[PDB]
Design a protein. Sequence first.
Lengths: 76, 52, 58
Amino acid sequence: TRNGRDSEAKRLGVKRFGGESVLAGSIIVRQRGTKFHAGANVGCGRDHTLFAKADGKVKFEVKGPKNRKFISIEAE
Amino acid sequence: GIREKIKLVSSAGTGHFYTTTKNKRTKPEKLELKKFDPVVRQHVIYKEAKIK
Amino acid sequence: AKTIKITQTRSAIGRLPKHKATLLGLGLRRIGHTVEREDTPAIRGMINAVSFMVKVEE
RNA sequence: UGCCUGGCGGCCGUAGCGCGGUGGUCCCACCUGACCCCAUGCCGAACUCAGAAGUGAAACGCCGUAGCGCCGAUGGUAGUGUGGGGUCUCCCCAUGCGAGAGUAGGGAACUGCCAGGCAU
RNA sequence: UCCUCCUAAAGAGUAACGGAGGAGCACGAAGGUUGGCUAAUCCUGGUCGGACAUCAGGAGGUUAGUGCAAUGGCAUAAGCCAGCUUGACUGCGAGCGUGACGGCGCGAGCAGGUGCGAAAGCAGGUCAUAGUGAUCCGGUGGUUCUGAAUGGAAGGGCCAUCGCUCAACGGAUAAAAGGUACUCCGGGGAUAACAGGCUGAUACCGCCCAAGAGUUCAUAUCGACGGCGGUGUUUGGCACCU
RNA sequence: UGUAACGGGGCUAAACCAUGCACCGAAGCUGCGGCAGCGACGCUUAUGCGUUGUUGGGUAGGGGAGCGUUCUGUAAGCCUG
RNA sequence: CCGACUUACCAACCCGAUGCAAACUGCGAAUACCGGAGAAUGUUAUCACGGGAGACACACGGCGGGUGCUAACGUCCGUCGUGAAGAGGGAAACAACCCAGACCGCCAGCUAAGGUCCCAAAGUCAUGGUUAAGUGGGAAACGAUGUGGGAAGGCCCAGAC
RNA sequence: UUUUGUAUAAUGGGUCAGCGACUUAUAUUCUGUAGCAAGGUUAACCGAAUAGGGGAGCCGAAGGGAAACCGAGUCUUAACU
C-alpha cells in the first residue's frame, strides 16, 4: 500500500483555561490560524500563539461583528 | 537545492561576516547590505564574498 | 446537628476508581459498615453518586 | 427638556436585505473650478486644494410595511454518566443531564458621551 | 526521517503492511514599514474577437487568492499595487509549551545602533504548520585566551562558519555481496509446514419469492434476478497445543 | 465411539410472567478468644507500657527481624565411662 | 445565409419536497479535562531528593472504534474490572463471567450472587394467569383457522357466512 | 520451571545418601554505627613490632570561567534592570 505515512502530533489546544491565574509570558493556547483573537493584555506570537503580557486571570469572551472569540487577561 | 550559500564580509576591516543563501544563476550581481557590526558597534556595509 | 446514617450494602471490588474514592470520602470500609455524617449537599451528592450500593437512614 | 443632523463607542442580525413614502434654515451628500499643496502604472473618477450658483435625483438618515434572512419557547424525540437486564450487529429498565430540526410566537433595534441647528 | 486530515472515543496524547496526499525546496524580494485597492463566476452592450484576451455597466459577496500538499486562518485583510529601505540586526530575556533525554518551539521587555511613518507605533525573516543530520576528525577568518626553561611559533581553546541521499534519516566502520540438500550449535510451538482447536469467506447440502423453460400450465422436473440457513467437508483465516 | 443441546433422576409444574412472606447459601459481615504492623493520645516511658482507631491475599521486587550448622575468643571454665 | 415546427430522448442554474458522510458543519449534548472556593472523610493518601529494583510477550469481559466476513478463544488502540499476582460460593466441570478480597482458631449467628422435589442445604409456599410443545432444556428468512388478553372495522331478523 | 494461561497429552526428576550455585581482591557511591571535628586520616617503611614513630599524600572547609584571571562572588557582553 501507499498510506503508511503520518506526522507527529503538535500538542495544540487551550493550555490555560478561563479563570486561571497565570504569570506574564505564559502560553494560553497554541493554534494554527487565528481561531482565538488577542484581546487586552494578550499578544499574538509568530505562529499565532496568544500569550499573556501581564499577570492576571484568563478571560474568554465573544466580541466583534464577526462573533470572534477573544482572549483577554483580567486585572489581578 | 540550486540556491547556494555565501557570506557577507563587513567593510569596516574587521573579520566579521554574516551568512545567507543566493541563487547564482538568476542574480549574478553581488550583494550589498547595511548590517550591524558588533565589533565597532555600528551599522556598516557588508559585501558578498566566496563562502570557501 | 441533623446527621444521617449511611450504611454500605455492597462490595467495592469491581467498582470504578471514582466510586472507590467516593466510598473513601464517605468513610465506608466494608459491607454493613455504618457511619454518621452531616446532612449537607456534598454528603447528599456523594450518596446519590454511589446510591446503588449504599443505604441512608434518617 | 422635545425634534433633526454629525463624530466616537457599547452590542453584533429581535441589530441585515427588499417595497413604498419623506428630509435641506443648520448638518451631511451629490455639486463649481483647478496656476498653486498634492495625485492618476491614462483620467481632479479616487486622493487634494480653493469655494456655495443648483439639487435632495443618487447615496445617506428617518418613518411605514411581514416578501425573506434572523431569534425562538412548552411538550415530545435522539444521544448519554452511574447501576441492572435482554431475543446482545442492537436495545430495554431506575435515576440525573438533555439536544438538533420543526411548531405557536417574536421581530422594521436598544443605549452612553460631545457638538451644531430649530422650538420651549 | 519530516508535514496535513481522518482513525483519535468534544482538553493533551494514542496503534496496524489502516484510509488519503505531500516535503529533502523557493525568495536580495515573494522580507520590514507607510499609503492605497478588492476578488471568483455569470448576464448585457462593443472592431478584428471566436465559449474564453482587453473595455463599460449590472448581479454576487470571498464559493477567489495565499510560491507549493492538506488543515486551521485571513476584509483592520495574512490576498493585490506603489514609494523608501535591510529588524533576514548584535548581546540578553521575566515566564511558559512539548520532550525519558539529546533537543525543539512561543515570548513581552532591557542596552547599543538601524529602517519606515508627522506620530502613536511596527520590524529578532516569509499567514502558521514539512523544506532535514547529533558527535568525532579536518578546512577558513577573527581573538595573546593558552603556549611543557624563557621570547616567539606549531598545536589546542573561544567566537563565526564549512565538509556526510551518514535516505537503514538518534547516524554500529572511513571502508563490505551470495550459497549450504555437506552442514553444525544454543533456543522457540514466543513462529511456519502435518494433524487437533475457534470461525465458515470458500466448498458441499437444504429452504423463502416466482419472471420464465415445460405446445396452453411457475411449482411433474428444472428455475433467472435476489434472500435465509445447516454441516465441518475442500482451499482458507487466526497462531490457542506440540 | 454412546443417551450426550436440563449435570442426572425425573417434572404438566418440580416451566414461564406478576405480587408477597420465609429459608438455605462464602474464608463477605457479626460474636468470642489469640498473634503482629502503622498512626492519635496519655505514662515518667527502660525508652517501650494501658487504652484507642485501623490494617494483615499476593508473583518479580524492596525493607525489617530471626532459627539452625562448622570453626575462633570467652574456654587449662562447664558436661561426660 | 436565415431558419421550420414537434420528439414516450438527455439535461445546467433556480424553486419545492426526501435521504447519505470518518477525511461535510449555518447547530449541538452527556461525559471527560483545567482552574477557584467550601465542609466532611482518608494511617500524607501528594510532591521533591537520595539508595535498590523489577518490567518493556500480556489475556479475557463491558463500553467507543480501525482491519477481517458488522467471522474467530482473530488482530490493533482508549478506558474500567478481573486474572497475571487472588483463595472462597454460583454458572455441571470451566485463570479472564456474577457475588465477594483468606492474620489464626470455633461442632456459633446474619446475608450477597445463585437457589429451596431427590442426588444436594433450603417452599411439593400463598394468589391470579399462560404452555400441551418435555416448549422450558440451542438458531433464521418464511409458512399455519394452535391458544390467552385488548381496542376498533365490514355484512347482518329489509336475513349476514 | 516457562507462560496471557498448565492436572495438562509442554519441560525436569526411578529412589536414597554425600557433594552442587551471588564468593574473593582492589577502587567508587549511599545507609547504619563508633572516634575526632574545620579538620579527619595515614600508605610503603623504621620498629621486637596489632604499641609507638612516619603527614609523603588524599578528601573537606569556595566557587565561576574553555582559559589567563577574578573571588563570596564569577562568566556572557561595550555594559547588564
